[PDB]
From a paper:
Canonical N-methyl-d-aspartate receptors (NMDARs) are glutamate-gated glycine-dependent ion channels abundant in the central nervous system. Their activation results in excitatory currents that underlie synaptic plasticity, cognitive integration, and memory formation. Each heterodimer consists of an obligatory GluN1 subunit plus a homologous GluN2 or GluN3 subunit, such that functional receptors comprise two GluN1 and two GluN2/3 subunits.
Our study shows how increasing the tension of the GluN2A M3-D2 linker by deleting M653 (ΔMEM mutant), in combination with addition of lipids and a PAM to better mimic interactions between extracellular regions of the TMD and the lipid bilayer, conspires to fully stabilize glutamate- and glycine-bound GluN1/GluN2A receptors in an open conformation characterized by four bent M3 helices and proximity of the LBD layer to the TMD. We, therefore, used the nanodisc structure to describe the architecture of the open state. In contrast, in our open structure, all four M3 helices are bent by 19° to 25°, and the larger pore diameter at T3 (5.1 Å) is consistent with ion permeation. Two of these densities are located between the M1 and M4 helices of each GluN2A subunit. A third density represents a molecule that is packed between each of the GluN1 M1 and GluN2A M4 helices, where it forms extensive interactions with GluN2A Y821. The location of these CHS molecules is consistent with mutagenesis and MD simulations of GluN2B-containing receptors (51), in which the four residues with the most notable effect on neurosteroid modulation were at positions equivalent to those in close proximity to the CHS molecules in our GluN2A-containing structure (W558, D815, Y822, and M823). Together, these observations suggest that CHS molecules may function in concert to stabilize the open conformation of the receptor.
Residue numbers in the entry:
A (entry chain B): 785 to 802, 808 to 842
B (entry chain A): 435 to 586, 601 to 840
C (entry chain B): 442 to 539
D (entry chain D): 540 to 579, 599 to 784
E (entry chain B): 599 to 686
F (entry chain C): 724 to 819
G (entry chain C): 531 to 579
The structure:
């Protein structure tokens, strides 16, 4: 186990042991769902117009 | 009545002026002079150094400075002061049993958190705020477009429905009646819920911007392992901790860094830490903890290392060694050291040390108050604007 | 001394590290004596014009018994010199900016 | 101990001044503004609506008719969303179990005068030790009460503590710290979060005037320093 | 009180944003609405509890390995891939 | 569940953890070593076997063996992300 | 020379979490549930009063 002790003594670093603002890309899925809503609303509006006619 | 140097600045005329001394060590010395029948006269060290083996320029001779130079040369007979016990000091003088057990620790800036007015709008970037603000109006007007043009909800009504769905307020008494408008409005309600939940999830963290720059782990921190120009930490020159860092086998890499930033006295280093000239100060647990308790802007780091004790050092061939050690032990057994700690060390002014989450105060959240005030001042003009519109 | 001259001086510096700690423990366990010296012949070890330089080059040409350092066990190097059992695991790997 | 939670734990997310400004200073001004905007629906109904918006539980409210009053209600509801988010964010941590030590220290009235309690305090140490000598020298009455509950050993005291036959065990700080560390479930803890009274040390006894004493002291200090 | 309005009300209770709804008049319908609103409280709590962690930044490596097409044939990219090692 | 923990080589234990959904490793590999093709002290194949092992390491042969024998996965379910609610975790509310 | 570099490690049971039907009612104890249920009705009836 002396090898292990030497490795911890000489080779250990910063990132080995190891809240941000949300961008458009971070929450792009929700806006995709809203766009799908717009598309579906237009589609069903056209469908209702066709049914009425 | 202690006779000490007047001006501690280097290159100044140091004349021994009689000032007056009092505190933990003076109280202990008075107790010793009471129990053991002897008379004393206190006088400060010639310089501000505790004592360290140094090589004098001529003949390259080992010499003791500060207290050790004062005592081993016969100028002083006893050292009642926070003198740490270690090999280099114990080889020449002899210490009594410790009258205070302590260790080395690091004092750093408290770093109270900085709160801005826009702290409430931090979780969403400005582009996201603009996007959602545009989306609200787009949804409202297109809801109106699909409701008015239905095969079978005024503009104010649609706008109010969208706004009250976004932020839960109930300002919308009217719901869409056309099927496409109902579908769009309700998925928009889901979208608004998602936005609100995402903004709420990390709102508290952005309200109080706490950072891990403060609360260094200690010497075990790889920041302490590898010195950098930006991160400057030091200690008292020619003291016990300096000897400990010099003699330690592996901490030489940061001892080299500390050798060029060492301070003359502990008070100067504490002041330098207080105004952010020094990032970290390594010193005894007792003094640093007392300063942290007294000063709200200074805090310790933890994991006390090099555990030792303060000893009343005397010469190697002295008659008071056994009696002083026995008196220190007896004062330890009964409630005398506890009384000294209570009256000199264990009084507190500001602590603010707890693992609980921080409590919101005026500074941390005032942007929301100013936002409400801005709403007041905006409505004060919008009422006149609406009156003028109604005039037309 | 300078690029103008073709000769130099043996400056006695102090070597310490992971490989040095290994070497010191080896010296205590095997009971031998050591004379470390840095190599300026080659970068790390390579066969150019059928001539080995660097750490391997110094070992193969009997200029030094041992080569302690960040020396990777290879096929050609093991064909030319004799290696010990590996004490740390290495290999070719890619590092990129996050 | 089983512990307790202070009744103010749910009021911890905001300081008293913040609560006051939120609910009696800012809310009243906002109600005045809402009513004034609407009149340009009594003040009580405006206060009721605003308070209902503070914690939206779908309480029955009468929304104002004016557009500017609606805008003020909207920005106030944004403030209420902020308030609810900030209050609920750390409510779990503030409403949490708090463990309070039974005794502050050896100078506590429980140790000094245990008789003035309906349940007598059960504390004692093992005999033939330094702790017994210290307690006998310092507190004679406490020692005379405590020798009745005298234990047999470290393990006997620990099992008496676990079962409940003993409430406090006064012993060496290092041994008690080791026992607390080794203990499973963290049921036994030292009072004061590591509070030490006599604060002596462990030493290697030697014959008076022994020639080995200086070298042993130097070597022990070397071990400490290195 | 058609089926569409019932669906609209129940959905609005799922994520209560004070959307305009028409509550049923019957007592048993009100009890069912209440138990569904309790279910909606459960759903909102469970969904929002871990939303912060799920909506978090994820770091994806540029290249899977040395056998990636970027290393083997770097020419078929608008930005040429910049990689190399020290010599000898 | 007759044995709470089993201490063994990283390769075998990791392969079993990948194959078996109900078994998981613990981490912080210790006693780092390697599998060797042992032969007698006085053997003629020592140098040739060692050189062949090294050559197979340099090119893509040990990688191929790892891919075809060790580096295939059936169920992992190993991630630092919070657990996703499924039928079993949240069903009392459905029954409610 | 090693043909596979590895180390010692520990294999244990995965221990998939156990979920019960009353899991949603767990955060409040039964006494707290009864107390809040009684409080709702007490407040309602004396609001009526
Ligand atoms: C009915 C038809 C006309 C579609 C209408 C969709 C719209 C509602 C818009 C509004 C905002 C649009 C989004 C705004 C921008 C984003 C970023 C965008 O990600 C990127 O391209 C890089 C980041 C950036 O754009 O700055 C992806 C689309 C998306 C989700 C958009 C998707 C479409 C959105 C939702
Ligand atoms: C709308 C009107 C009725 C005012 C709003 C009520 C609150 C402001 C009052 C009512 C009751 C008050 C509490 C009642 C009593 C408690 C305990 C009281 O003493 C303790 O902390 C006991 C600690 C312990 O025994 O361990 C401290 C205040 C406090 C939290 C009070 C805090 C303020 C309270 C909540
Ligand atoms: C008529 C309208 C304006 C409503 C009036 C509301 C007040 C009667 C309530 C609401 C909030 C109450 C406050 C909310 C909490 C605070 C903190 C609280 O300080 C604490 O830390 C908790 C108590 C403790 O720690 O002992 C003291 C009460 C107080 C001022 C309360 C005082 C009474 C308040 C202002
Ligand atoms: C960089 C900075 N430093 C600050 N120091 C202070 C303090 C304590 C005195 N505030 N503060 C800031 O607020 C900023 N950021 S800002 O200049 O881009 C900015 C200005 C104004 C607002 C409005 C937002 C809506 C409510 C009203 C104020 C928002 C953002
Ligand atoms: C100890 C235990 N083990 C269990 N194993 C299972 C599983 C997977 C099959 N469920 N389960 C339990 O539920 C319990 N706990 S219980 O017997 O006190 C209990 C029973 C019934 C209810 C109602 C609550 C309202 C909704 C309907 C069910 C609530 C509590
Ligand atoms: C937590 C304290 C709540 C106090 C609520 C007061 C509500 C007053 C309403 C007055 C309506 C006329
Ligand atoms: C007649 C009313 C139908 C309402 C349908 C709402 C559908 C909402 C889908 C939301 C998905 C996130």
């Amino acid at each position: 186990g002396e090898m292990e002790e030497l490795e911890t003594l000489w080779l250990t670093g910063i990132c080995h042991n190891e809240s941000s603002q949300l961008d458009i890309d971070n929450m792009a899925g929700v806006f995709y769902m809203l766009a799908a809503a717009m598309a579906l609303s237009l589609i069903t509006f056209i469908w209702e117009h066709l049914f009425y006619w | 009545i202690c006779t000490g140097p007047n001006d501690t600045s280097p290159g100044s005329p140091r004349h021994t002026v009689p000032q007056c001394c009092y505190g933990f060590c003076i109280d202990l010395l008075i107790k010793l002079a009471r129990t053991m029948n002897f008379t004393y006269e206190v006088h400060l060290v010639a310089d501000g150094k505790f004592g360290t083996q140094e090589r004098v320029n001529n003949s390259n001779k080992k010499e003791w400075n500060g207290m050790m130079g004062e005592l081993l040369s016969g100028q002083a007979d006893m050292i009642v002061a926070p003198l740490t016990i270690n090999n280099e000091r114990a080889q020449y003088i002899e210490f009594s049993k410790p009258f205070k057990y302590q260790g080395l620790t690091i004092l750093v800036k408290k770093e109270i958190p900085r709160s801005t007015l826009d702290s409430f709008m931090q979780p969403f970037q400005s582009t996201l705020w603009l996007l959602v603000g545009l989306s609200v109006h787009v949804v409202a007007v297109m809801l109106y477009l699909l409701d008015r043009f239905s095969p079978f909800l005024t503009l104010s009504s649609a706008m109010w429905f969208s706004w009250g769905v976004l932020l839960n307020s109930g300002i919308g008494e009217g719901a869409p009646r056309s099927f496409s408008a109902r579908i769009l409005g309700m998925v928009w309600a889901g979208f608004a819920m998602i936005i609100v939940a995402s903004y709420t999830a990390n709102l508290a963290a952005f309200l109080v911007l706490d950072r891990p720059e403060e609360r260094i782990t200690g010497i075990n921190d790889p920041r302490l392992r590898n010195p950098s120009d930006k991160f400057i930490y030091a200690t008292v020159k020619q003291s016990s901790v300096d000897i400990y860092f010099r003699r330690q086998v592996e901490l030489s890499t940061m001892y080299r860094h500390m050798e060029k930033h060492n301070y003359e006295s502990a008070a100067e280093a504490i002041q330098a830490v207080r105004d952010n000239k020094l990032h970290a100060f390594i010193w005894d647990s007792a003094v640093l903890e007392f300063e942290a308790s007294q000063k709200c802007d200074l805090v310790t780091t933890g994991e006390l290392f090099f555990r030792s004790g303060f000893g009343i050092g005397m010469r190697k061939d002295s008659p008071w060694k056994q009696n002083v050690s026995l008196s220190i032990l007896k004062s330890h057994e009964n409630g005398f050291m506890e009384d000294l700690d209570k009256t000199w060390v264990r009084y507190q002014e500001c602590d603010s040390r707890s693992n609980a989450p921080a409590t919101l105060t005026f500074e941390n959240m005032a942007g929301v108050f100013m936002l409400v005030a801005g709403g007041i001042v905006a409505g004060i003009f919008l009422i006149f604007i609406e009156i003028a519109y109604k005039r037309h | 001394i300078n690029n103008s001259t073709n000769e130099g001086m043996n400056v006695k510096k102090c070597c310490k590290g992971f490989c040095i700690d290994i070497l010191k423990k080896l010296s205590r366990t095997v009971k031998f004596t050591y004379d470390l010296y840095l190599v300026t012949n080659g970068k790390h070890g390579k066969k150019v014009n059928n001539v080995w330089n660097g750490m391997i080059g110094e070992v193969v040409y009997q200029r030094a018994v041992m080569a302690v350092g960040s020396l990777t066990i290879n096929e050609e190097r093991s064909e030319v010199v004799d290696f010990s059992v590996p004490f740390v695991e290495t290999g070719i790997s890619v590092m990129v900016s996050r | 101990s089983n512990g307790t939670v202070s009744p103010s734990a749910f009021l911890e997310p905001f300081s008293a001044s913040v609560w006051v400004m939120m609910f009696v200073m800012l809310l009243i001004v906002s109600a005045i503004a809402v009513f004034v905007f609407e009149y340009f629906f009594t003040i009580g109904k405006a206060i009721w609506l605003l308070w209902g918006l503070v914690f939206n539980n779908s309480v029955p409210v009468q929304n104002p008719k004016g557009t500017t009053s609606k805008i003020m209600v909207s920005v106030w509801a944004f403030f209420a969303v902020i308030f609810l988010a900030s209050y609920t964010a750390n409510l779990a941590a503030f409403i949490q179990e708090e463990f309070v030590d039974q005794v502050t220290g050896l100078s506590d009235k429980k140790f000094q005068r245990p008789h003035d309690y309906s349940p007598p305090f059960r504390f004692g140490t093992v005999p033939n030790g330094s702790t017994e000598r210290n307690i006998r020298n310092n507190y004679p009455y406490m020692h005379q009460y405590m020798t009745r509950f005298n234990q047999r050993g470290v393990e006997d005291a620990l099992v008496s503590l676990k079962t409940g036959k003993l409430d406090a065990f006064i012993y060496d700080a290092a041994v008690l710290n080791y026992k607390a560390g080794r203990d499973e479930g963290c049921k036994l803890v030292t009072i004061g979060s590591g509070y030490i009274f006599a604060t002596t040390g462990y030493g290697i006894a030697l014959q008076k005037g022994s020639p080995w004493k200086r070298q042993i002291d130097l070597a022990l200090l070397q071990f400490v320093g290195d």
